[PDB]
């Protein structure tokens, strides 16, 4: 078993995690390049595999606590960059990829928190430190 | 931690917040200009970053209490303008952007309130007072 | 605070509200005419404002109680007209717009009411009595 | 107030209601023929009204009890017809329209009923008996 | 009233029902061939009726209990056929139609069942035994 | 009855199941090649059957426990392959198909687990060991 | 001080109290329409007041003594009506409201009485004679 | 006053009461179909009345004495039926309704009786012999 | 020590306590806005504090003695208001808040009193006179 | 009359009762499949009867005396089985059903017994030996 | 053995216990983050442990004696804070945690005391002085 | 018969029982994975058995006497672990399972003891020494 407190996204400025990090989710994708020739041993769909583009997307939720890493993401959004982002998996290790800052949003209610979602997507080739 | 009572949207007439402000949510966006060349170190999707257009959208909910700032939004809608709007983040600061008044709606039930949603979207270059 | 019992939609025949008026909701819109030139001080989306068309839509729910104003809406639907409709906001005032009768529906169950939704949309220039 | 037990859909064979009639809902529509000229007193959307086509749709739910009127709907579906259907509104009166039998479905579970939905749509000019 | 235990889908091999048959639902359709001429006594939509194609779709849910009729459906899927399927309605009778085996799926959790959905659709002319 | 603990997806490296396997679901498909000629004994839709392509999709949920089979799926994703995957059905048997690793995602919260979904789709002709 | 023997519920047939009236309890309600705007002088919850629906419920206990007023309540239950009911408060006065007969129950033991509870709820606008 | 020994539930086989009948309680219900329109003379809740479904439930307690009427209830439970049940009210009269045998339970202790509860609920239209 | 006879709720008409005041209980609340970030020095739950809404509720029991202050509460209920209410704490002092009259109920038995409960809840910002 | 000492639950190993059997209670259930069509002679709820699933639950209390039948229940719980259980009714006879061992619990105090509850529920079709 | 007079809750102003402290109860919690993988040596539920959030709640009862520490809690409630609270365990030691003042209530009867409950909950990381 | 003084819960540090152990109760559970197919010989509910997850929960009450095993549980709670716990059944034997320390609470009154409840739940696979 691995603690959900262990997997951490973190910005550059040298890497530090953001403050409100209530729920985060790295999500990989591939578009499944269908190569269905007429011949196929039972009429099954055949796929190519390595031809497909592959992606990554980070969706971080949290409560707005002011930190320099939280101010950094605003500066990354206004001065639109694609810097290095890094996401630990507990016992796998970090990812250390270039991402962008696709859509952030700050929210607040009459009774609750200052909360924020932070949605990111892949911008380059990723890595894995094991 | 930051109080959700602190983040406030406010109209011009000089800036004052609207009356029913039950839930508000500034939401930024970027359309992620995909620049996927054939070469990429693992077949990863590459992104450009700063080429993407960037936006902002404000969705304010609340209960209809008559105020001059609430009458102002009706006047902003009928006389269709794009005036300056300003949204505080608690410990970041204000935004102070030109927005429009994209869609408002007043609602009432047989037993509940006169309530209203107020949806806005970005209309120009934004700012940040820190 | 304003009572939800106060905001009232009403038909012409001279104006009278309909019988079952369980939940009603005037909803305004504008389509946000995007004018995004290449220049923009941070790559922000610029909007025009007053060029956008603007609309209104009324969605009234209620229980079927037979009234002359309820029979009027059937006559407005079959003899398809766009007469004047009027919606009070409690402390703002009336709207007094020409609408049509876009979609109505009567519903009933084995145990419940004869209920109806009544969906309307803008058909002309609106007003505001303050 | 009007009882939901009063509003009844009924088939021809002379008119009789179907057996399982748990929830029924006549639903009218019009497609809102937008006539938005450049001139309009506040930039409001103008509509034409009577040019729009108008429709009706009946969605009847119920439990499968075998009746001749329930067998009739199967015969109306296989021998595809558009016969006269009639829906009472409690204190308005009947509708008496030609409809078709667009989609029916029979359902059953390991523990529950033999249930059925019966979806109809308008096929001609409707009426109103007052 | 009719028991939901009575309505049964069944495969050929001679007809036998499948093992896990938790919830099943035959669903008929017609696409409603709109014939809306300019003339129509109130501007009502006119429909043709018998010109529309008509269909049937069976969605059977259940828990995976191994039976020869359950193995048959796998053989019907891999060796893609359109054999005769038969669905009883309690007091109507059987349907006895040619269907295909459009999409099946087996599912299991860490604590629950081996469950399966079985989705079918019409493949020919249907029948009714009364 | 069959235990949901019995149906197991498993990777190659020789086959071993993955660690967190909270909910898994093989899902087959066929696109239903509609062959609707003008003649049909009641206007019923006719289908061809064996002409349709047929597919399979595996959606595995689970909690991130580090295993070599869990590291294998990351290596299958970055070095994009279409290796053999194998899914037991309790009393049917295995499937043993070539699949790809279409989209995986790792997720974690401030209080919960390191969890992951693992979505796969068919890449070749499948099998069945009975 | 006021005698509990004085407060009396009574049916119409002209008003007479029921026979076994061991314990009776009129109970009023309001659902407290919460209008909590973001501003509030100490973060206190603000309420609207008059927007809330208001109700009444009568729970009468007693021993089954046969009377015409006791037979009346059975006739009110089977022929489901909402007639006028009247409840005296000793020195306030009567209420004289339309109620329904929501749930009655007759009970008896091997040694005790024929007893009954009689639960009623508001059905219209109430009154007060002072 | 009426003796609690007089009110008797009784099964069919011709009607005979069950043996252990320590405490019995017929209980009627109606779900109170709320029809609360926006207009109401003091904001009072309005109710419809006759639209509500109405029910009956019998809860019989007693000590297990073997009788043919006690064996009958076991046969009614295993061979699940909805036969006629009849409950006398002392000076009102019988009820004579179709009920089912919803939940029975036999209980015994190391020192006490063989006791049983017998819970029934309405299954059809009831009656009243006066 | 402080006498329970000292703490007194009182209505406006100028403030006077109600007659039967057998047991009274002001009760304050806050909904505890949970702000649990992933970081926390032992995994402890962190809370925000001042963001939570805060309330007050008064539950007064007593015997119905007719007084003008007791008639006032009936008038406050029928003419639904939110007037000022005031509750002394013996050596703290008064509260002097706006409340509503949420649910009152009058009760009487065949042998006991005319008794009443009186339940109130906060409607505005409260105070404290020290 | 029947002795509570006579009704006995008993395990298989051939059937023997457990040691501490202070209070035991077989409890049957049915979920009452509501079939309420719009028509019903007085608006009464109609029920289907035999469509409902039916269950059984055994709750045995007792003091922990070590017996092989008491050790058997621990072995039935750890090696999770659904073996045959048998419950005598004094003059009815046995039940002889397959049950599971849903929840057991051992309890002891500083002064009292080693006591245990043993809760079981139905797992198959039951019987009755008369 | 340890005296219940020894365990004491105490406020800051430097720490002093409150006056009426009739019954007090610190209560800790953890939400038990269920990590139940499909594999488990007997089908047992597996738990993670340290991932769960952990809490504390203090419920203090007492009689209202006016003290500065009792006035402090009112000031902590109106000026909503989360100050340090401290609870001795007799021979363990203090806790010294930040709590809030979630719900207090003052109560009094016609014959008894001015009594109060004081309910608190954890607001931060706690401690232990041993 | 078995003494309640014999069944003992005990912590690790090697195993020792806690000091105040006034009432303790191991409680096992299984969630009863319902596998109710449409076929069942009398419409009885069928269950699977071994698919259900199985649990254990320990609720220990006692008076706070300071011991190293009592200090251990505080250390187990703050440093959140899931160590081995062991519960003797008198003549069965020990259990020896991994549990967590889900919720403890210390309580004291103005006249009584320092008392504590200690609630635990299963965290892994259990055992049985016979």
TrEMBL record, chains A, B, C, D, E, F, G, H, I, J, K, L:
Protein's UniProt name: Phage major tail protein, TP901-1 family
Pfam families: Phage_tail_2
Domain of life: Bacteria
InterPro entries the UniProt entry points to: GTA_major-tail, Phgtail_TP901_1
Organism: Rhodobacter capsulatus (strain ATCC BAA-309 / NBRC 16581 / SB1003)
């Amino acid at each position: 078993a691995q603690n959900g407190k262990d997997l951490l996204i973190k910005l550059d400025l040298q890497f530090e995690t953001i403050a409100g990090l209530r729920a985060t989710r790295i999500s990989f994708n591939a578009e499944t390049v269908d190569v269905t020739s007429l011949e196929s041993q039972g009429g099954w769909r055949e796929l190519l595999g390595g031809a497909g583009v592959r992606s990554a997307s980070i969706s971080g939720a949290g409560v707005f606590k002011d930190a320099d890493t939280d101010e950094r993401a605003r500066q990354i959004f206004f001065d639109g960059e694609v810097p290095e982002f890094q996401v630990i998996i507990p016992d796998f290790g970090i990812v250390q990829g270039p991402f962008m800052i696709t859509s952030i949003d700050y929210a607040g209610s009459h009774n609750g928190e200052a909360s924020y979602e932070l949605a990111m997507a892949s911008a380059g080739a990723l890595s894995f430190t094991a």
